Amino acid sequence: AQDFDFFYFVQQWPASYCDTRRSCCYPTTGKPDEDFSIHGLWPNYENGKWPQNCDRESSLDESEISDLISTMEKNWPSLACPSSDGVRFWSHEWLKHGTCSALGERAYFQAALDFRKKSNLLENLKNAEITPRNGEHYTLESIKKAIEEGVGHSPYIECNVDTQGNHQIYQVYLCVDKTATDFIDCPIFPHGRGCGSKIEFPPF
Ligand SMILES: Nc1nc2c(ncn2[C@@H]2O[C@H](COP(=O)(O)O)[C@@H](O)[C@H]2O)c(=O)[nH]1
Ligand SMILES: Nc1nc2c(ncn2[C@@H]2O[C@H](COP(=O)(O)O)[C@@H](O)[C@H]2O)c(=O)[nH]1
C-alpha cells in the first residue's frame, strides 16, 4: 500500500545559509526572522533511498494555499539568488517531494508549518540557554539534547562552515511518520559525517 516509510522534516538556520562562500538573497518580503525555517518535508525509505518527482504532471496551485502564503513567506522563505517570493522554491518542493507524500497540496504545506511550530527549535534551545552568538561556543551535545527534550525524539544535525572557518549548525533533521501525524524516532539518519564537538549558532 503506502509508497514510503517515513518523512525527514528538514529545517534550516537562515543565518548559516547566509554567511558562507555562496550567494544568499533575502526574500521579496525582506530579511527573514532569526528563527529556524522550513527547508523540506521529504518522503523517504528506510533503506536510505527515496521517491521523488512522483507526478510530473502536477504543478503547484497557489489558490489552494492562498491563505497560507503570507505565513509561508516567513516560515518557508527561499534564500537563493535572485531574491524571490518563495513560490519557485515551494513549487519545486511540491513537485519533487510533495507529489510523493500521499498528501494533497494544502495538507502537505500545512503539515510542514505545523511540524515547524511543534518542533519549536529556537525556543527549545533558549530553554537550554543556547542562543545565537558568534564563534563555536556550543557543544553539539547540548544542542541535540535541548531539541530532544522538547521534541521527544533526537534530531540529526547537519553543519556547514562560515566564511571564517567556523563550523556552524546549518540544518536540523527530525522524522515524521508516513501519515504525517507525529514525530517519530528516525529509522535511519543521513551519513554526511559532520559537526565537530563545538559549533557556532550564528546571528544574522
Ligand atoms: N527524501 C530525500 N531527499 C533527499 C535526501 N538527500 C538528498 N535529497 C534531495 O536531493 C537534494 C540535494 O541537492 P544537492 O545538494 O545534491 O544539490 C535535496 O534538497 C533533496 O531534495 C534524503 O536523504 N531524502
Ligand atoms: N537549502 C536551501 N535551498 C534553497 C533555498 N531557496 C531555494 N533553494 C533551492 O532548493 C533546492 C532544494 O530543494 P529540494 O532538492 O529539496 O527539492 C536547492 O538546490 C536550491 O537551489 C533556501 O533558502 N535554502
Side-chain angles (χ1 to χ4, degrees), residues 8 39 42-44 48-52 92-93 96-97 173 190:
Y8 269 135
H39 175 165
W42 308 335
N44 220 84
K49 296 178 184 172
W50 61 82
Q52 62 169 53
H92 171 59
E93 289 300 313
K96 186 174 183 181
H97 301 287
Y173 292 65

Side-chain angles (χ1 to χ4, degrees), residues 73-201:
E73 293 179 315
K74 287 202 181 178
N75 298 323
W76 200 330
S78 167
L79 305 170
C81 292
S83 168
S84 55
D85 58 7
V87 175
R88 162 189 284 196
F89 185 27
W90 306 327
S91 169
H92 171 59
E93 289 300 313
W94 168 250
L95 278 148
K96 186 174 183 181
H97 301 287
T99 59
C100 300
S101 71
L103 298 179
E105 300 186 26
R106 182 171 180 93
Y108 180 72
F109 289 98
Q110 188 75 60
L113 296 167
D114 291 351
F115 285 114
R116 190 200 71 84
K117 299 180 169 67
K118 285 176 187 173
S119 68
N120 200 38
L121 301 183
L122 192 64
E123 296 293 302
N124 280 319
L125 288 167
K126 273 177 183 170
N127 292 349
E129 298 188 295
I130 296 164
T131 64
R133 63 190 292 168
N134 287 74
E136 310 181 328
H137 184 78
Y138 303 101
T139 59
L140 174 65
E141 278 298 308
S142 63
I143 288 167
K144 302 178 75 74
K145 285 204 182 75
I147 296 173
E148 192 169 46
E149 179 175 61
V151 175
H153 303 279
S154 68
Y156 165 74
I157 302 66
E158 170 187 357
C159 293
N160 66 169
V161 185
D162 72 14
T163 304
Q164 304 168 193
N166 296 288
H167 301 282
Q168 50 183 195
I169 181 288
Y170 170 50
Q171 289 189 142
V172 176
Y173 292 65
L174 286 169
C175 290
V176 171
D177 81 289
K178 74 166 82 62
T179 72
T181 303
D182 289 82
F183 286 118
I184 55 163
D185 298 323
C186 286
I188 187 171
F189 289 113
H191 298 193
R193 175 178 55 176
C195 296
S197 51
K198 292 296 228 75
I199 60 175
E200 180 182 74
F201 183 24

